[PDB]
Design a protein around this ligand. Structure first.
Ligand code: HEM
Ligand code: HEM
Ligand SMILES: CN[C@H](C)Cc1cc(C#N)cc(OCc2ccc3c(C)cc(N)nc3c2)c1
Ligand SMILES: CN[C@H](C)Cc1cc(C#N)cc(OCc2ccc3c(C)cc(N)nc3c2)c1
Ligand SMILES: C[C@H](O)[C@H](O)[C@H]1CNc2nc(N)[nH]c(=O)c2N1
Ligand SMILES: C[C@H](O)[C@H](O)[C@H]1CNc2nc(N)[nH]c(=O)c2N1
Ligand SMILES: [Zn+2]
Lengths: 410, 411
């Protein structure tokens, strides 16, 4: 019940007790492990208060005022507001805490060593899509910082009862368009083909390129969503060149500097924030391995190897592997050359082990999802591969939520 | 209950019902997943239900469920248990059992081959010398001059746990590891502890970088004995690179036959503590883990140096570049010498086909993503995007403690 994890490269053994504070369930059972599954109605008054108490209890513990008048007062104060208004509002301090700890508890995020340096933008006074646009432009500009990226989250008003949901329909704030083409294949980004279309099907005029920055589709208070174009001057992009292959430039690749995920739900003390775009900076493999080389994406492997004139006749020449590496060397080279923040998978995984040992030390553990933490290339030469991890759900948290167009009462 | 898995690259969805036949536990609860944890004396009482379920499975597979042959065999096993407190498997049952232990191995990417296992019945074996003979024949048969063939050799089952047959080697063929006084390691760091035991037991070590370890064999609970595998039975492959002429000068080689010998085979409640089995290598086993793991031969740096890479910053990905070349060389050397090997692209593709086929005919295929995804280039192999369900079916291969931690020494 007081579990241990071993690192098999170093024989370091850490002891986990934090998992006992877990509440939400994993999807696994005694007879079956679902650890590789991608994805395994309002809160009532009786539902909401224990959730609020749990949260305030951990908040006042964290500021070392557990069992204080201030604690008991605030407990009292929220309990009465709940029975009154059937919901409650967080103080700014608790909002910031809640957001930082939702990143802290994100068992799938390799970048959590940075979790306490999160910039939190309170957008709970927002009322309109135009308002949302303004807040999102300010987020983008602040986070980008002329290439010196800074972590940030912007939090819009909380769900009241599903009727007045704030939603960012984009999956990220900045992403390239994906177009069906009569020929057969797909121009731009295949992952975004449906959304690219819903934009047009809403009224967007597409330049029909391969790297068209998508418009924002913003939903305030549950109204029909609205199209907004991000000022191009706010969208930092990196031309992709290779430090030894001149011909790499001629492939015509670029990517954006700011990874800003915008379709998730932030849960704090029972309250649900359906619109909460957050952003950090990229690990190189996210772009070079997944975005460029997933067959379901830009899938440029064949073309790169072709230009390297590798032997593509058989898989055992490992031409895919060889090209995959060059591609990722190039992504890192390009961002670094342009002084845009990026981290390689060796550096980030090493940072994460240090973060793990930190969390075990000062917190008694660190929920971690091996299947997502291990990078998508060169797994076993990174230190997290040989690191046993325990995965469990802590709150406050980031949660998945349905795509709006499947739900929204049009 | 029905359970679905999605391949996110192909949007193919499969439905698992086989998990319902799962008996053993995973280590996971509804509040904690132990999916990345490496590891998460039996009486007459619990044995007959274990036997019955096995025999029910066996006779279903041969389409004779509920037949007189089925019921008589049940009765026969029952009486033998009540009388002798254990029982013996028919040859047919053993063969079925061993194949299905492999079929059930959720961490094995090579299971498309499970039905083609060559099973050697060594249950008449009584001494260490006899064990050595059986194992030599296994090695010769399996190796087949480079044309590798899957095989398992099954020694007598546990009885009171005081008379175990054990192979003390983790694999039949492995290289020795020597700790030096200056803290360096000569050979395979993975085998320093076992090497030391051998030496204590009287092995005269050559003390080179690639010394094939002797067999340390334990029969019927007696003290283990040392034997040397005849060198002409040990097929080795010098490693060279197709474009890099300096690569051969690193002086590396590896053996052709992977043969795991420290696992326990469970069939119908019976425990076979010595059951060495072998197939053939996936390249990355050697080229990624054996050569490039920091706790192994760890040749990444030397290879990178000779490629003249930027080894200053890690973001130059000199490690990733060196790793690919080392793995190219491993595949190149084996194919050139006509020794059976499979690259991780071919193997993972085959496994997906196998997995789909298994859902169709069997209602599921238990699979451990953490182990199935290759240790390099994960997401450009099709298993990365494949959701999987992990559960435990019997017959099965299980882990067991190293014998030198449990053995009672005779003298
Ligand atoms: C600052 C540097 C950061 C790095 C390098 C980083 C890196 C990563 C990576 C590589 C993944 C794997 C996901 C994928 O492959 O698509 C991930 C997942 C995730 N990250 Fe981080 N991240 C960073 C910052 C943040 C921040 C600021 C937040 C929120 C405040 C966050 C929250 C998450 C969440 C919730 C997931 C998993 C979501 C899911 O279940 O799919 N990350 N991160
Ligand atoms: C014939 C070609 C085969 C290939 C290419 C293959 C491949 C692999 C690989 C790559 C692993 C991961 C192990 C690691 O990375 O340390 C594995 C695990 C495993 N294999 Fe296979 N294998 C083959 C044949 C067999 C046979 C013949 C058996 C048994 C009769 C078997 C039983 C197992 C078991 C029980 C494991 C799990 C070991 C553990 O849990 O630690 N395999 N296999
Ligand atoms: C094709 N695979 C899909 C896109 C998996 C995924 C789904 C969702 C959602 N909803 C959200 C996801 O976000 C992962 C994530 C979230 C935040 C990140 C930040 C802030 C930085 C960064 N470098 N990577 C992130 C990665 C991922
Ligand atoms: C340092 N990591 C350790 C060695 C993991 C491991 C432990 C054990 C045991 N006991 C058994 C193991 O077996 C894996 C295995 C088993 C059989 C294989 C066969 C038959 C062929 C092949 N190519 N690889 C195998 C790989 C692995
Ligand atoms: C900690 C982690 O579970 C451990 O290092 C596992 C991960 N996956 C693996 N996968 C394979 N094929 N072989 C291994 O030895 C391991 N080791
Ligand atoms: C099927 C599998 O769960 C799926 O492909 C997962 C595997 N691991 C991952 N790991 C990361 N970091 N990101 C991902 O999208 C995925 N996808
Ligand atoms: Zn699990």
């Amino acid at each position: 019940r007081f579990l241990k994890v071993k690192n098999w490269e170093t024989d370091v053994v850490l002891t986990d007790t934090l998992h006992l504070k877990s509440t939400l369930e994993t999807g696994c059972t005694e007879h079956i492990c679902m650890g590789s599954i991608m994805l395994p109605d309002v809160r009532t008054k009786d539902q909401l208060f224990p959730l609020a108490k749990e949260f305030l209890d951990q908040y006042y513990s964290s500021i070392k005022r557990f069992g204080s008048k201030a604690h008991m007062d605030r407990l009292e104060e929220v309990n009465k507001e709940i029975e009154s208004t059937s919901t409650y509002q967080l103080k700014d301090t608790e909002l910031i805490y809640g957001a930082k700890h939702a990143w802290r508890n994100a068992s799938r995020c390799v970048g959590r060593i940075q979790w306490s340096k999160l910039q939190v933008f309170d957008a709970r006074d927002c009322t309109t899509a135009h308002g949302m646009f303004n807040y999102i432009c300010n987020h983008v500009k602040y986070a980008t910082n002329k290439g010196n990226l800074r972590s940030a989250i912007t939090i819009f008003p909380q769900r009241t009862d599903g009727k007045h949901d704030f939603r960012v329909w984009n999956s990220q704030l900045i992403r390239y368009a994906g177009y069906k083409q009569p020929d057969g294949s797909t121009l731009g980004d295949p992952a975004n083909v449906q959304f690219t279309e819903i934009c047009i099907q809403q009224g967007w005029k597409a330049p029909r390129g391969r790297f068209d920055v998508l418009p924002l589709l913003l939903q305030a208070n549950g109204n029909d969503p609205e199209l907004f174009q991000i000022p191009p001057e706010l969208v930092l992009e990196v031309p992709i060149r290779h430090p030894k292959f001149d011909w790499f430039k001629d492939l015509g690749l670029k990517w954006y500097g700011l990874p800003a995920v915008s379709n998730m739900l932030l849960e704090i003390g029972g309250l649900e924030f359906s619109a909460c775009p957050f952003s950090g900076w990229y690990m190189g493999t996210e772009i070079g391995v997944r975005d460029y080389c997933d067959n379901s994406r830009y899938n440029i492997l064949e073309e790169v190897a072709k230009k390297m004139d590798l032997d593509m006749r058989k898989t055992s020449s490992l031409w895919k592997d060889q090209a995959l590496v060059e591609i990722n060397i190039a992504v890192l080279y390009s961002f670094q050359s342009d002084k845009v923040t990026i981290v390689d998978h060796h550096s980030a995984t090493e940072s994460f082990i240090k973060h793990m040992e930190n969390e075990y030390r000062c917190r008694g553990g660190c929920p971690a999802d091996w299947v997502w933490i291990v990078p998508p290339m060169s797994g076993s030469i990174t230190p997290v591969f040989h690191q046993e991890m325990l995965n469990y759900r802590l709150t406050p948290s980031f949660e998945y939520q349905p795509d709006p167009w499947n739900t929204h009462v049009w």
